[PDB]
């Protein structure tokens, strides 16, 4: 609890990857970022295929391991980690100064980043993180 985020981003109806790309750039810049309403974040494309890719990631693994998240919480963070040199000191510092949350635990409403919004009126082929998570078998806590 209590994360002194310099920036609070609202992912509701926003394209996950594009938001993720911007959060990484800011975290490496020194900004403490809190991504909010991840369950409501969005990702375009044909649902059936999207789900297939994520279900495969859950299935992939062995003794050494491949921990792939099922909750929208972890999925968004893993998406962001893929955009950071998380194994490097500078990269790990950034990734750890970033946190994703289900819903919005802060008082302030998060800000919608430029170019991340998806016009629901203009789009029918996309999915919500929660929808993916529910399909993965995640316990709907949100």
């Amino acid at each position: 609890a209590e994360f002194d985020a310099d920036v609070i981003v609202d992912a509701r109806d926003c394209i996950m990857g594009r938001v993720a790309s911007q959060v990484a750039e800011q975290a490496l810049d020194g900004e403490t970022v809190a991504v909010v309403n991840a369950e409501r974040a969005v990702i375009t494309g044909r649902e059936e295929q999207i789900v297939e890719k994520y279900e495969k990631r859950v299935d992939i693994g062995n003794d050494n391991g491949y921990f792939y998240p099922k909750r929208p919480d972890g999925i968004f963070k893993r998406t962001i980690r893929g955009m950071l040199p998380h194994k490097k000191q500078r990269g790990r510092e950034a990734f750890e100064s970033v946190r994703v949350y289900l819903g919005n635990p802060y008082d302030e409403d998060g800000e919608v980043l430029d170019g991340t919004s998806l016009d629901r009126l203009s789009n029918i082929k996309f999915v919500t993180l929660g929808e993916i998570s529910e399909t993965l078998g995640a316990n709907k806590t949100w």
Binding site: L121, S122, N123, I124
Partner: protein, 172 residues
């Protein structure tokens, strides 16, 4: 393109967001009409279906939205009715509406009753060997009717010989 639908005097149609509600003497039906760049609004006493794009895919849906709304107009006034006839060859089949689901007993001599839950505010009136599915939502009615006919599906044996089962006799 743009298509204006004059709403009947008996009807009252209201729309909030992408959901359209159509109210009438026979009841009310609400549907979601969601498609890329097709805006459906209620202008006084005429529903408007329009879009800036005129491509084949868009035209397909605009034509679909039209019929959906018209069918709603018809449902809240005249209503929707499907007729059915229960037919059997050797084993007398008992068909009863129990609770919220039509139940069929002794089908083809089976001990276990076949049942199916009725969709929405659809009514299934039974009088002897005739059934009548009715309601304001064509979606719900048409399905309930189909579910009834499907309930007596037979894959294991020859349909041409074993012809028992309820059947859609009249389609609106």
């Amino acid at each position: 393109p743009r298509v204006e639908l004059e709403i009947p005097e008996d009807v009252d149609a209201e729309q909030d967001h992408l959901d359209i509600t159509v109210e009438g003497d026979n009841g009310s039906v609400t549907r979601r009409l969601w498609y890329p760049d097709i805006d459906v609004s209620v202008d006084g006493d005429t529903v408007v279906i329009e879009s800036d794009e005129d491509n084949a895919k868009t035209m397909s849906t605009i034509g679909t939205f039209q019929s959906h709304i018209e069918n709603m107009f018809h449902g809240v006034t005249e209503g929707w009715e499907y007729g059915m006839e229960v037919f059997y060859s050797h084993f007398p089949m008992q068909v009863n509406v129990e609770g919220d689901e039509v139940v069929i007993e002794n089908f083809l001599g089976e001990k276990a009753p076949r049942r199916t839950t009725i969709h929405g505010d659809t009514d299934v009136e039974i009088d002897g060997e005739e059934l009548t599915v009715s309601g304001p939502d064509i979606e719900a009615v048409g399905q309930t009717a189909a579910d009834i006919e499907q309930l007596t599906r037979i894959n294991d044996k020859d349909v041409r010989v074993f012809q028992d089962g309820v059947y859609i006799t009249r389609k609106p």
